[PDB]
Amino acid sequence: EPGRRGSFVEMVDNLRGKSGQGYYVEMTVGSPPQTLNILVDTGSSNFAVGAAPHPFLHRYYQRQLSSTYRDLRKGVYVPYTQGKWEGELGTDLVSIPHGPNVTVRANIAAITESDKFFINGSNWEGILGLAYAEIARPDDSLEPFFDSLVKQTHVPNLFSLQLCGAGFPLNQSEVLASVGGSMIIGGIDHSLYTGSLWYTPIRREWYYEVIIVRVEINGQDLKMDCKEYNYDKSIVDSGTTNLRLPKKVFEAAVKSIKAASSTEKFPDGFWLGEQLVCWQAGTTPWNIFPVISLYLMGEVTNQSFRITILPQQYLRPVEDVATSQDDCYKFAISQSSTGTVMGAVIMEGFYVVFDRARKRIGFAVSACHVHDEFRTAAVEGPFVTLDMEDCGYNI
Numbered sequence: 001e002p003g004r005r006g007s008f009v010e011m012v013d014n015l016r017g018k019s020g021q022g023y024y025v026e027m028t029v030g031s032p033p034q035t036l037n038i039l040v041d042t043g044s045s046n047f048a049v050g051a052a053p054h055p056f057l058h059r060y061y062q063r064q065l066s067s068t069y070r071d072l073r074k075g076v077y078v079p080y081t082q083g084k085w086e087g088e089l090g091t092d093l094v095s096i097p098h099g100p101n102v103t104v105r106a107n108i109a110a111i112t113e114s115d116k117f118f119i120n121g122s123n124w125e126g127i128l129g130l131a132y133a134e135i136a137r138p139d140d141s142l143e144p145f146f147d148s149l150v151k152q153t154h155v156p157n158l159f160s161l162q163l164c165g166a167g168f169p170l171n172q173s174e175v176l177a178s179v180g181g182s183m184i185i186g187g188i189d190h191s192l193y194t195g196s197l198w199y200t201p202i203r204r205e206w207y208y209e210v211i212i213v214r215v216e217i218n219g220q221d222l223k224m225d226c227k228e229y230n231y232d233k234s235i236v237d238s239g240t241t242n243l244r245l246p247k248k249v250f251e252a253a254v255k256s257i258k259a260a261s262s263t264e265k266f267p268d269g270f271w272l273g274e275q276l277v278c279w280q281a282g283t284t285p286w287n288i289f290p291v292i293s294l295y296l297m298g299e300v301t302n303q304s305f306r307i308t309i310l311p312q313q314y315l316r317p318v319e320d321v322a323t324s325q326d327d328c329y330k331f332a333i334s335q336s337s338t339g340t341v342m343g344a345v346i347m348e349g350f351y352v353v354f355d356r357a358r359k360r361i362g363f364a365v366s367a368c369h370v371h372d373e374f375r376t377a378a379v380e381g382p383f384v385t386l387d388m389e390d391c392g393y394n395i
Ligand SMILES: CCCN(CCC)C(=O)c1cc(C)cc(C(=O)N[C@@H](Cc2cc(F)cc(F)c2)[C@@H](O)CNCc2cccc(OC)c2)c1
Pocket: 019, 020, 021, 022, 039, 041, 043, 044, 045, 079, 080, 081, 082, 083, 084, 116, 117, 118, 119, 135, 136, 237, 238, 239, 240, 241, 242
């Protein structure tokens, strides 16, 4: 054996927030620096910040107060799965207080109009799209923040995320004081995970696309054409709460999860991810819910590995409408019409390494994943898997 050291203490514990409202990191924009909390989103590629008054904002980017502000004289529109905003493009000096000790000039979309974007009480005022230029708006000529970072400094072309779910509800005061995780810019901090890191190839450099080759519910093969699992794509996305699955896969998965948890009957509203279910304080029946294993393509030919999540991950802690002492949760898995989305829910169980330089994504059991005395999340390998390329979808 050998104890693994944590070499990025300055960036450890630099995140705050929760799955339902998003995880954010502190950043500064302009000269003098204007502090803003920014949502970490591996599912988009635009750096955008509120730049005008809004009901849900306590602060915003004030361009006229920045001596280093540069107007690009260009508008920008970004529509997400849910949520959208319109803004004005420009560049300015950006820094990350609890990140690498550097300052870089990056593109910034000054949000002037929005709909269902900002979240009341999230405590964040903007978003950091960490994906590739291909999906950046207006087009791929608008260099993403991380690309600027790497091009302008010596920071390694890699970042890692440790999203830490509390395992229980956090009120407004609590979520503000609590440590929500870590975003290590330019490296891998070994104190953030246990066990080994397994890498799956980044299929294409647009979203952080990966390939799922097998799915199990308590060891039982969901037994679908693996191509179904990646229809029309599978991505790792910190900006979305739930595990989102292709319609057909969702239907099959819910049927299996229901069968595994059949000793307890849950209302349709629960399975739709709409209504919460509650249990007397401390009696949540974790054991009746199955673990979910997702096999991912490995870096070695015909080899895969699997990540296993617990219901402590796919059941999201929520406060009871009556703020009682019961432990309540919502089913954090929903259907998609745009492929698989490995959201915040899933990421909370693992330390995820976005190794841009080597075009791969690594997974390891998170040092902060919620579990019980009987089961733990896992990252295991290797497995002999054939024709994995056929699992990928082509339009
Ligand atoms: C995370 C806080 C809770 N929310 C939002 C409030 C209900 C969700 O769980 C959620 C739910 C759905 C169902 C989509 C998105 C969604 O679109 N997320 C965005 C980021 C985000 C947007 C927002 F408006 C508010 C937020 F908090 C977070 C990206 O992760 C999407 N990546 C894929 C994609 C899809 C289409 C276009 C695209 O552009 C490149 C990227 C987010």
